[PDB]
Structures are given as structure tokens and as C-alpha cells.
Design an enzyme around this catalytic site. Structure first.
Site, PDB file in Angstrom:
ATOM      1  N   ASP A 159       9.015  38.411 -17.045  1.00  0.00           N
ATOM      2  CA  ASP A 159       8.107  39.540 -16.881  1.00  0.00           C
ATOM      3  C   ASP A 159       6.654  39.087 -16.711  1.00  0.00           C
ATOM      4  OD1 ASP A 159      10.472  40.814 -17.790  1.00  0.00           O
ATOM      5  OD2 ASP A 159       9.483  41.910 -19.400  1.00  0.00           O
ATOM      6  N   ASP A 190       0.740  37.892 -18.775  1.00  0.00           N
ATOM      7  CA  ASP A 190       0.923  37.735 -20.202  1.00  0.00           C
ATOM      8  C   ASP A 190       2.389  37.543 -20.581  1.00  0.00           C
ATOM      9  OD1 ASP A 190       2.087  40.261 -20.051  1.00  0.00           O
ATOM     10  OD2 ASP A 190       0.846  41.128 -21.624  1.00  0.00           O
ATOM     11  N   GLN A 192       6.179  44.015 -25.020  1.00  0.00           N
ATOM     12  CA  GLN A 192       6.900  45.094 -24.373  1.00  0.00           C
ATOM     13  C   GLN A 192       8.335  44.616 -24.083  1.00  0.00           C
ATOM     14  OE1 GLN A 192       7.542  45.161 -20.357  1.00  0.00           O
ATOM     15  NE2 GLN A 192       7.596  43.037 -21.053  1.00  0.00           N
ATOM     16  N   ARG A 235      -3.237  41.299 -18.334  1.00  0.00           N
ATOM     17  CA  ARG A 235      -1.846  41.682 -18.560  1.00  0.00           C
ATOM     18  C   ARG A 235      -0.982  41.166 -17.415  1.00  0.00           C
ATOM     19  NH1 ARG A 235       1.585  45.835 -17.319  1.00  0.00           N
ATOM     20  NH2 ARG A 235       3.053  46.528 -18.943  1.00  0.00           N
ATOM     21  N   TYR A 263     -11.079  40.091 -20.368  1.00  0.00           N
ATOM     22  CA  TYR A 263     -10.714  41.365 -19.759  1.00  0.00           C
ATOM     23  C   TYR A 263      -9.956  42.271 -20.708  1.00  0.00           C
ATOM     24  CZ  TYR A 263     -13.336  39.878 -15.866  1.00  0.00           C
ATOM     25  OH  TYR A 263     -14.406  39.518 -15.059  1.00  0.00           O
ATOM     26  N   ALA A 314      -6.977  48.412 -22.951  1.00  0.00           N
ATOM     27  CA  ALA A 314      -6.408  48.713 -21.646  1.00  0.00           C
ATOM     28  C   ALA A 314      -7.439  49.503 -20.840  1.00  0.00           C
ATOM     29  CB  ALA A 314      -5.136  49.547 -21.779  1.00  0.00           C
ATOM     30  N   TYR A 343     -10.974  50.755 -19.751  1.00  0.00           N
ATOM     31  CA  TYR A 343     -12.234  50.810 -20.484  1.00  0.00           C
ATOM     32  C   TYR A 343     -12.013  50.745 -21.986  1.00  0.00           C
ATOM     33  CZ  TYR A 343     -13.546  52.668 -15.987  1.00  0.00           C
ATOM     34  OH  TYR A 343     -13.744  52.842 -14.642  1.00  0.00           O
ATOM     35  N   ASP A 353     -12.355  52.763 -24.419  1.00  0.00           N
ATOM     36  CA  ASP A 353     -12.591  54.181 -24.585  1.00  0.00           C
ATOM     37  C   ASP A 353     -11.731  54.864 -25.637  1.00  0.00           C
ATOM     38  OD1 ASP A 353     -10.182  54.046 -23.179  1.00  0.00           O
ATOM     39  OD2 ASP A 353     -10.942  55.025 -21.380  1.00  0.00           O
TER      40      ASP A 353
HETATM   41 CA   LIG Z   1       2.560  49.608 -16.099  1.00  0.00          CA
HETATM   42 CA   LIG Z   2      -8.736  44.868 -18.754  1.00  0.00          CA
HETATM   43 CA   LIG Z   3      -8.896  52.181 -22.624  1.00  0.00          CA
END
Ligand SMILES: [Ca+2]
Ligand SMILES: [Ca+2]
Ligand SMILES: [Ca+2]
Ligand SMILES: [Ca+2]
Ligand SMILES: [Ca+2]
Ligand SMILES: [Ca+2]
Ligand SMILES: [Pt+2]
Ligand SMILES: [Pt+2]
Lengths: 436, 434
Positions: free
Chosen positions: B137, B157, B162, B222, B257, B263, B265, B267
Site C-alpha cells: 500500500d 507511508d 490503515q 501519506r 507535510y 490531513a 490544513y 484545521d
Molecule cells: Ca483516500
Molecule cells: Ca499534508
Molecule cells: Ca485537516
């Protein structure tokens, strides 16, 4: 970014700096600059006074008082723009903007003065650009001279679509037709960053908007009070958003910064554009929920519904919230300026490539790190100098170890515990913070 | 950005272009390039084949088949990276990355081959960097040579945190110790953009992370399957996020990053970091609600709680949603590449300074405009060429009026009506849009 809590703001006391209040009870001190003579030069927005301050003694001289400046006690008009010519030694010019009566009630004028070293005063005024919009709100008026030898001037959206100007149509997205330009009708010069030749003329290489090249460089701004060039020629900016989404922007030629259709990112999160000018009648109330909830009769457009061109998102929002956010304090900081820290022989450790952004409502000065190419922010806005003060501007000494900041004479600020006070610790002050 | 609806995707049929299938019998075609010979060169991920197709006539030849490539039918592994030396006429090298058995079960190897024009094949394989992580993956594996003559390589990653690798601790934030590096232990080379010298060594001006200079150029990624330089030397990137927040990033030396702590921003919106490797109970289930709703026993960290250093937000997210979003489709597009549209004498009107980003899940190619300095995106990601196809890669002809796309052999894609189909219109094909 996500808002800091009252506790996170409260602990940002900067015990690594000595604080010395140089002056207090200035009359709406607004912009300060490190003078060609190595003195602090600062403006009083209300009086139009240009003050020169010796930081060591606090000795003050009124170098000049711009005549006929118009200021409302309850407004943000008055003397605004203030810059020196970059090569002052050979071009002893001071550039200002201010609110004056418009004979044709006010206008904003960008004017050059010549500094006379002999008589220590300003003279030979030349109006570079007149007939600019004026109002009591969101005037902005940051004036800087770029490496390209052009004047960059921020002119706010005049407060349209909020409070006293609620029902007036916001013009942040509007641009002049050639006919208006021909008639020197600058009504669309609201919510813009203007780029002018030093004589006030339109730069032939200005961006074209809706088929016309005008003084407009960027548009879609609300209250852009911060404007600062980086050492590699980029233009950083800070701007007040509404209940949310104060911004740090990178100003790119011809960019559209979205206001009022978009606040912060185009994310439909915590803001929607409620256009009161298009409301069914003028008796409708602004619920002041940032457009997320509005009274019946006002058209609302999601940020995602806007048919925008050249929309440029902010580098950082202070702050962004979700629709569930309780506006009834707001997730904003009211940035009042934007200063590119240049370091120097006594540069403060770790402050390379930082942008300093004074906060009016939070009583902190944010330190925002950018990568060495000033292409992105790194991490978050870090609060400093927490106090019950409305920070209005900040600069550093050439050596870089001393920060000079202005505070408002009056207004509200958040205390350590989150409540509001209008008891400011250092009303209308010039304060120096020296790295220990 | 806010998600488009199924009807907004459905209408994106780009009716202004003629579609022609060039090749239709490809097996997991992965990367395509406009070669130095003005032919199109493309890879087959599972077979390890490298094909060269005449863009005009469509004739094709298998130039080489990279031996011993390892691929799992249920995986994203196999032959990945593919690039030519920028001065191919004088330096006839092809650089690849691929999944190979690790005799020390697999590893990723960045390898150089020499092109032999007279026999039209590849020879003299040189392993530039071996012992790189490998899994089924999030392998990523985009390999490009920058203007600085360094190899830039994206290494995902590995799918940690997951599905089948749910309980393995994500290493996107982790960096090598000098000891590890000196021992050629590249286990932390997961969720990174690497920058290597052409011989595989560490560039002396690579950034330092945690006090060590390694091949890491950026970390906190990711599944970054898109990497492309702009004409002015900037590095644009696309990356798959989890249930949300696929990203367009500008890659800056030494940047973090944020994955997996952040994931999109920072936020605290629609995502939170649920670290299953830190869940004391390994029988815990992943509710797959993007960390917003989790089962008891897994530590959750808000994006805003992360103590990050050098965190760089995306230029654009595809897409960001609020905590009220119902993940039970997902507000993503699964970007599979990133291509800087260079225009040319028949450039498509309005496509100046665009970044083309193929979408696997939506069956569109997004066009993302940037300003002329490639400093900011302008407006939104505009979908084009809607079809029941998983678009894997995209390039344009030199003149700019023809787009060449690769499509997956199999998988799921959203139809015009929003429902999913695994009936792909053009399985494993090389298609052109004129
Ligand atoms: Ca996805
Ligand atoms: Ca990012
Ligand atoms: Ca976010
Ligand atoms: Ca505000
Ligand atoms: Ca904006
Ligand atoms: Ca917004
Ligand atoms: Pt600090
Ligand atoms: Pt289109």
C-alpha cells in the site's frame, strides 16, 4: 488555523524581553518607522501629526502635522499611509495617505512630502492620487514602496456590508471601467491593493482586470492593514476578516483575494456571504453570525457558489472555524499590521524569516515563521507579549534585538481569562521590547 | 476546497476534445512520459515492462522488462519510478524504482539503466539506493530529476495506520539517526520526498531533520503519487489523503507535510489522528470515520494538538469537510499523478500555468490553475474528461493540444450518477484527447 484558547493566549508573556514604555497617551498612534536618522518616526491618525521620537530619552518632536486631516472620533479615518522613500539620502520624500474633505463627505489622498533637513519639516506637498474612497471603517491605508520603486497601497472595503454601512454594496470585487478611469472615478478602489508609479500614475505593467489596467494590483480584500515586502521581493500581507478568517496573504499580481464572497479559504466553513445591499428591505437585522445564520430577506451565497476568477487563498487564517461555531470572542485576532523581521547583527535567535503580526483584540504580537524562500508559512502563529493592550504596529531596530510597538489609545482587548476589558495597560503607547 | 457533487462531476465531460484509444491491452499501465525521442514511453506496473509508443501511429514496442519485479495482485507495488536523464543524448540513462525481494519480504530499489539505442534495450543496471521500505500500500514512487540534476523520489507511508497495516506505527514523521543512516537502514524512509544524487548518495545540501542530513527532502506524506517541476523550478506535488484531504502541495526543502498528525490544513476539521499502533488492544477496530469517530482504546490527537515543526499546509485540498460530515462517496478524488502543463504552439486556451491531476476514483482529470510564478493556485480544481475510468497518469504533447492518459486495468470508479462501478470503460489503456 484553529483558535488558541484564553489559556494559550494568557501564557504568551515573552519573559525573554525587557519592556520599556517610551511614551503613552499618544493620540491614536498608528504607524511607526525606523527613520533615516535612526529615530523612531510615528504617526497620530487622529491629529495627522508626524512624530519623531528618540527611543533612549523618549524625547519627542512634532516634525509635521498634515493639515486638514479629517478624523471621526468613532472612525478609523485620519492620517493612514506613511513611508519614506527607499533611498531617502538622495530622495528625501515622505509618502502618506489621509482622509481629507472632498470638495466634489471625504476622500482619501496619497500625497508626497519633501523632507527639509535644514528646517526639520515637511513641505512641497504633491497629491499623487486623490478622490479615493473614504469612510469611517476599514480604511486600511498601509503604504509601502516596493523594490520595483512603486507605491503599494492597501485600501479597505470601507466597511460595506457591516454595521453603519451594512446596506451599501461591497466593492471589493469591482473594478473600474475605462470611462471611470478616464473620469478619475475611483469608487471601485475599495478592498484593493493598489500599485502606483511614484508620481501617482498607473503603471503600464499593472494587471488587467475585466479588460482594464488601473491602479489595482490585487482585489477582493476586506481590511488589509498589513503589507510588507520580504528580502526576496515577495509581498506579505495581513487582513482583518469578519467574525472569522483574519488572513496572512501572499500578494500576487492580479490575484483576487475573494472578499466578500470568500472569507479565508474557499471552504464553506464558518462563513457565508450575506449581501445586505441585496436584502429585501433596509429594516432587516444583521444576526452577526458571519452569514452562517441570517435573518429572512438577505441573499446568502456559499463561498463555493461564487463564480470567481483568480481566487488566491490565504497562507494562514486566524482563525477558521466550522459552521457549528458559536458566535454568540469571535475566532479572529484583528491583525493591525504585518512586519517582515530582517534580523541584523543582534538578530533574535530562531526569528529568521518571520512575519510579525500585531493583534488588536488579543493583545499579542504573533510571530509567523516562513521557509527561507518565503513561499510557505511553517507551523502556527505564535503569540508573544501578551498584555491588555491593542497592538497597532511593530518594527525592529536595524540590529534586530529591539522591537518597537505602538498600542491604541482606546478600545477593547481580551484579558488573560478571556473576558473583555477596555482598560488598556498602555494606552496610546510607544513600547520597546529588548531581547534579554 | 469543498467537494463537487456527482452531477458536477457528471457534467465534466470535456466536450471540446476528441477521444481516441491508442492502446487498449495494457496491464496496469502506471507512468507515461514524453521521451527524448519524441515517443511516448510507459510502464506496466506488475509486468515491469517498459513500452515505447509512436504518438502519431500508435505502433508499440516493448523496450525492456525489468526482471524480478514483485507485485501483489491486491497491491500497489511493482515497477514504479520512471524517468530519463535530462541530457539523455549524452547520458542515456533511465532511472526506475521497483519492488524487489529483499534477501535480507520486499524492498524498493531505485535503479539506473543504460539505454542502448542500437539494440533498443536497457542494460548495465546499477542499484542507486536499495533497502527502501516496501509494502502493498501507499508506495507512491514518482521519480523525477530536478533542474538541480538530483533525483526526487516520493515514497509513501506504506499504508501504516490503515487496513492491513493498521497496527504498524506510521513513520511519515520519523527520520533516521546518524547510526541508522550510516548502516543504510532506511526504515524511516516512509512518507517522504527523497532527494538523492544521481549515484544514489546524499546531496551535501540536503536539509537536516532532527540533526541529521539524509536523503529525506521533505517528510509527513501519506501517498504522494504526483511530483512535477514547474518551468521556474518549483516542485508541485499531489498526494492522496485518507477519507478526506487529498492534497496539492508545493514541496519546499525541509518542509514537514504533517501526515499523519495533520490531513490537509491544520484545521481540526473532518479528520483526527487515531494512532492504532498505540492502541493497547490490538483487536480494536478502525471505524473508518477518519478519526472523527473512533472505537474505545485508540489514542486520538487533534491536528491542533500535534507539536509539529516546519509544518507546511497544502496549496489545495480535495477535499476538506467539517466534523459533521458523514463518511457513511468520501470527499476525496484519489489523485494519481501531477503534471505541469507546458502549453506550446497549440496550447489549450486558458490552460496557462495549470497543473493536471488525474483522479482514480472520480474518473476525471482535474485542471488546477496557478499564477504565472507558480506561487499560488487560482480558483478551484476543474474536472475534465469524466468517464468510468480510473485515470492513472497524464501528459501533453509538445504542442499542447493533445493529452495522453493512462487508465487502470481494474478497480472502482464513481459513475455519473454517483454510484460505484468496477466496469471500466477503457481498462488498461493509453488514451488521447485532442
Ligand atoms: Ca483516500
Ligand atoms: Ca499534508
Ligand atoms: Ca485537516
Ligand atoms: Ca473581524
Ligand atoms: Ca481572502
Ligand atoms: Ca472560508
Ligand atoms: Pt516566542
Ligand atoms: Pt472544461
Amino acid at each position: 488555523d484553529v483558535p488558541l484558547t484564553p489559556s494559550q493566549f494568557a501564557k504568551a508573556k515573552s519573559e525573554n524581553f525587557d519592556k520599556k514604555v517610551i511614551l503613552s497617551n499618544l493620540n491614536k498612534p498608528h504607524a511607526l518607522l525606523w527613520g533615516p536618522d535612526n529615530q523612531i518616526w510615528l504617526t497620530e491618525r487622529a491629529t495627522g501629526k508626524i512624530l519623531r521620537v528618540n527611543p533612549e530619552s523618549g524625547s519627542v518632536k512634532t516634525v509635521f502635522q498634515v493639515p486638514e486631516i479629517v478624523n471621526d472620533a468613532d472612525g478609523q479615518n485620519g492620517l493612514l499611509g506613511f513611508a519614506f522613500h527607499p533611498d531617502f539620502k538622495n530622495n528625501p520624500y515622505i509618502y502618506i495617505s489621509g482622509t481629507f474633505k472632498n470638495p466634489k463627505p471625504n476622500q482619501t489622498i496619497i500625497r508626497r512630502y519633501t523632507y527639509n533637513k535644514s528646517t526639520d519639516t515637511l513641505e512641497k506637498p504633491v497629491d499623487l492620487l486623490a478622490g479615493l474612497p473614504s469612510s469611517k471603517d476599514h480604511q486600511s491605508g498601509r503604504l509601502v514602496i516596493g523594490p520595483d520603486q512603486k507605491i503599494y497601497y492597501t485600501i479597505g472595503d470601507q466597511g460595506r456590508n457591516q454595521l453603519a454601512y451594512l446596506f451599501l454594496p461591497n466593492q471589493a470585487q469591482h473594478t473600474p471601467t475605462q470611462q471611470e478611469l478616464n473620469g478619475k472615478d475611483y469608487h471601485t478602489y475599495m478592498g484593493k491593493v493598489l500599485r502606483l508609479n511614484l508620481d501617482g500614475s498607473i503603471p503600464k505593467d499593472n494587471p488587467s482586470f475585466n479588460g482594464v489596467v488601473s491602479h489595482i494590483y490585487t482585489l477582493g480584500h476586506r481590511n488589509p492593514q498589513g503589507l510588507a515586502f520580504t528580502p526576496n521581493g515577495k509581498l506579505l500581507q495581513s487582513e482583518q476578516g469578519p467574525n472569522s478568517d483574519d488572513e496572512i496573504n501572499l500578494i500576487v499580481k492580479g490575484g483576487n483575494y475573494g472578499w466578500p464572497n470568500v472569507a479565508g479559504y474557499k471552504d464553506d466553513s464558518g462563513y457565508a456571504y450575506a449581501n445586505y445591499s441585496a436584502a429585501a428591505n433596509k429594516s432587516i437585522k444583521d444576526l452577526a453570525q458571519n452569514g452562517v445564520k441570517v435573518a429572512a430577506g438577505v441573499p446568502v451565497t456559499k463561498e463555493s457558489e461564487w463564480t470567481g476568477k483568480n481566487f488566491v487563498p490565504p497562507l494562514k487564517t486566524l482563525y477558521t472555524v466550522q459552521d457549528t461555531y458559536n458566535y454568540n470572542c469571535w475566532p479572529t485576532v484583528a491583525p493591525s499590521s504585518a512586519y517582515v523581521y530582517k534580523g541584523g547583527k543582534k538578530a533574535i535567535t530562531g526569528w529568521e524569516n518571520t512575519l510579525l503580526v500585531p493583534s488588536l483584540k488579543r493583545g499579542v504580537i504573533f510571530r509567523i515563521k516562513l521557509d527561507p524562500t518565503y513561499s510557505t508559512t511553517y507551523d502556527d502563529a505564535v503569540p508573544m507579549f501578551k498584555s491588555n493592550n491593542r497592538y497597532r504596529d511593530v518594527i525592529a531596530s536595524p540590529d534586530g534585538n529591539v522591537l518597537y510597538v505602538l498600542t491604541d489609545t482606546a478600545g477593547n482587548v481580551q484579558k488573560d481569562d478571556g473576558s473583555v476589558t477596555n482598560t488598556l495597560e498602555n494606552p496610546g503607547s510607544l513600547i520597546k521590547f529588548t531581547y534579554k
